[PDB]
Amino acid sequence: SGFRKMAFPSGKVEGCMVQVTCGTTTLNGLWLDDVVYCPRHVICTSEDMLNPNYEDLLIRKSNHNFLVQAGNVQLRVIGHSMQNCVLKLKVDTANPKTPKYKFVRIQPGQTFSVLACYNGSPSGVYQCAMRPNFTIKGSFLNGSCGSVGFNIDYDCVSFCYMHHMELPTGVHAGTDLEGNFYGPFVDRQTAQAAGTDTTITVNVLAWLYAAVINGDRWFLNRFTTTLNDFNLVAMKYNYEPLTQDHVDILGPLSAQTGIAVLDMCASLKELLQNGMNGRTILGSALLEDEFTPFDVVRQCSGVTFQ
Amino acid sequence: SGFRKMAFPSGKVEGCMVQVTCGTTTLNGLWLDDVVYCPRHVICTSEDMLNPNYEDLLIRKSNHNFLVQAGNVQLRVIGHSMQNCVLKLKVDTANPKTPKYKFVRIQPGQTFSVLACYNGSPSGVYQCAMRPNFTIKGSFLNGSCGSVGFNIDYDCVSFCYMHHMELPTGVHAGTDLEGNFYGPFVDRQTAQAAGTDTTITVNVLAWLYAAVINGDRWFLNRFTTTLNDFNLVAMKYNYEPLTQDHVDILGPLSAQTGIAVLDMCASLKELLQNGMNGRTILGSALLEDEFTPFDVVRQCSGVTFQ
Ligand SMILES: *[C@H](O)[C@H](C[C@@H]1CCNC1=O)NC(=O)[C@H](CC(C)C)NC(=O)c1cc2ccccc2[nH]1
Ligand SMILES: *[C@H](O)[C@H](C[C@@H]1CCNC1=O)NC(=O)[C@H](CC(C)C)NC(=O)c1cc2ccccc2[nH]1
Numbered sequence A, B: 001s002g003f004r005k006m007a008f009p010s011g012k013v014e015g016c017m018v019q020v021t022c023g024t025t026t027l028n029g030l031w032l033d034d035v036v037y038c039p040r041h042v043i044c045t046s047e048d049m050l051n052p053n054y055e056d057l058l059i060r061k062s063n064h065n066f067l068v069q070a071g072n073v074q075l076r077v078i079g080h081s082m083q084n085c086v087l088k089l090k091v092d093t094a095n096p097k098t099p100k101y102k103f104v105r106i107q108p109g110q111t112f113s114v115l116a117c118y119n120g121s122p123s124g125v126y127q128c129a130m131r132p133n134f135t136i137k138g139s140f141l142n143g144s145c146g147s148v149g150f151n152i153d154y155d156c157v158s159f160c161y162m163h164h165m166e167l168p169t170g171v172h173a174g175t176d177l178e179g180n181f182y183g184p185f186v187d188r189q190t191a192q193a194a195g196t197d198t199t200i201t202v203n204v205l206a207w208l209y210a211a212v213i214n215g216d217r218w219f220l221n222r223f224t225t226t227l228n229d230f231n232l233v234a235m236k237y238n239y240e241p242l243t244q245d246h247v248d249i250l251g252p253l254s255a256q257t258g259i260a261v262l263d264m265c266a267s268l269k270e271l272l273q274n275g276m277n278g279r280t281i282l283g284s285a286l287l288e289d290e291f292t293p294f295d296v297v298r299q300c301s302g303v304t305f306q
Helices: A054-059 A201-213 A227-236 A244-249 A251-257 A261-274 A293-300 B054-059 B201-213 B227-236 B244-249 B251-257 B261-274 B293-300
Strands: A017-022 A025-032 A035-039 A067-070 A073-075 A077-083 A086-091 A101-103 A111-118 A121-129 A148-153 A156-166 A172-175 B017-022 B025-032 B035-039 B067-070 B073-075 B077-083 B086-091 B101-103 B111-118 B121-129 B148-153 B156-166 B172-175
Touching: A017 A035, A017 A121, A025 A067, A035 A156, A054 A077, A111 A156, A201 A244, A201 A251, A201 A261, A201 A293, A227 A261, A244 A251, A251 A261, A251 A293, B017 B035, B017 B121, B025 B067, B035 B156, B054 B077, B111 B156, B201 B244, B201 B251, B201 B261, B201 B293, B227 B261, B244 B251, B251 B261, B251 B293
Parallel strands: A101 A156, B101 B156
Antiparallel strands: A017 A025, A017 A067, A025 A035, A035 A086, A067 A073, A077 A086, A111 A121, A111 A148, A148 A156, A156 A172, B017 B025, B017 B067, B025 B035, B035 B086, B067 B073, B077 B086, B111 B121, B111 B148, B148 B156, B156 B172
């Protein structure tokens, strides 16, 4: 029993982190096979960062300009290219610790583990969700760029995120491993807006199911509702609209608990309309939206990887 | 910027987890050098667990009764002993992945990372605090026993916790790596009480400092207070009393932020007396007590390990 925000074990990713230095800027890169991947803004001076012409800046660079260090060892750069907002450095040595991996672009509302790194050394791990507005609520300081987000499926690491930026609102933005930003952001030193941060309704419902499974049922009420009526409440509270595919997703959880999705929608409606009256659910005084249905199932049925 | 519950990278510990089977009971063991450590209740039948005589039960066991599997490989048990509530199995093979390690017994209020495991395979990692009442608020199912808690200091893994039990209240109990329980608990299948769960006052203050550092300052008030007066509020709210050593601990954070500890105590007093008025601090509608001063500093100054 019990329900916690849980990250994937981080050992397969730890072995892939390197340090990348160009001039004075140091950040993290990901070393898979004979390629190191890092944020292209590593080539920027403090001045360049305001309005960079990355193509011109990259032109002035040669292989030997890039110091790629994996521990106390220097890798030899034999090639470089820019892909969207990521730099790919070709090196002469395949990473002997390369795990089975793929690059994926995750959808809003999905979760992943971040391995927060500095100077190519892992610092810590935590779980994040890609918000509907394509930001994450992380913990990142200067030096953290190039830290990656990932899921583990079997023995296969799916990399989905590389860290680039912090927004004025204190949230975080970055790219997939092909260098395309999640959301509207650009890699330039300007204050940028993510827009309204809507709540991941399906995730909240998953978490309510988790609560029930774990014996917290006080918020269950006598009422039911309809999708359209529920959503008419959702919209008001900046909740993502609930689709029928969302209902299909929640199906196993509904089935395991004996509680209809629309009944749970009704209980949620009351919580939105009434708040929680200074009570808690799974130790929180707020509705939590950063667990997927999958996350709930896996944690409530003790799934593993290796 | 940003502040998250963060675990240590788990790679050095992943390589130390094995599976231990005796009869039908399977759980996790920790494989360091030529010794595997696991909960002694692995030797129990469902019946035995009610009122076990571990010495008698262990007598009926021989080396060959213990199946220790590290991946698809069986280790050879050449010796067994009981130390308090932990079994030590001597095996013929030193773990080639043994990290630099020590066993420590942590104090109430300190944090550690849990690597939650099933069948000797890591499932996930999260941060916990040892509560004043010697429990932790984890996520553990049947099969999780033998999962370990740890800190990383440099390249040295300090193991501090092994999982044994879930209490009626849904919290968790276990031992140090010498097999002495944290708290009053015993390894028998009886409902056991942890007693009043007091709040780690010094940790709450650390977290308020973290909030300030991160720009959330709304709860700062115009007032100051004294230790004795503050504590007279603490006691009422089941907060651990604040000592002067606690003040010394918070010294750097006070110093970095320009906010006196007793001023912060005053702000805390108002929050205890007034609540939060449906506002949040670092994304929480509750006062958080599972970050140490050290945790705050390290996360706010990006400390690393490898
Ligand atoms: C890379 O390590 C670093 C990560 C951030 C530093 C603080 N927290 C972080 O997550 N990224 C940057 O420093 C980037 C670099 C640009 C060129 C992509 N800049 C920003 O995050 C940035 C610039 C800026 C300007 C106004 C308001 C916010 C803001 N954020
Ligand atoms: C070991 O994997 C297992 C871990 C718990 C199962 C559910 N969640 C857990 O964290 N530990 C046990 O099953 C132990 C075994 C005893 C012999 C030490 N038993 C309990 O946790 C237990 C027994 C019991 C009886 C009444 C109320 C609570 C309670 N918990």
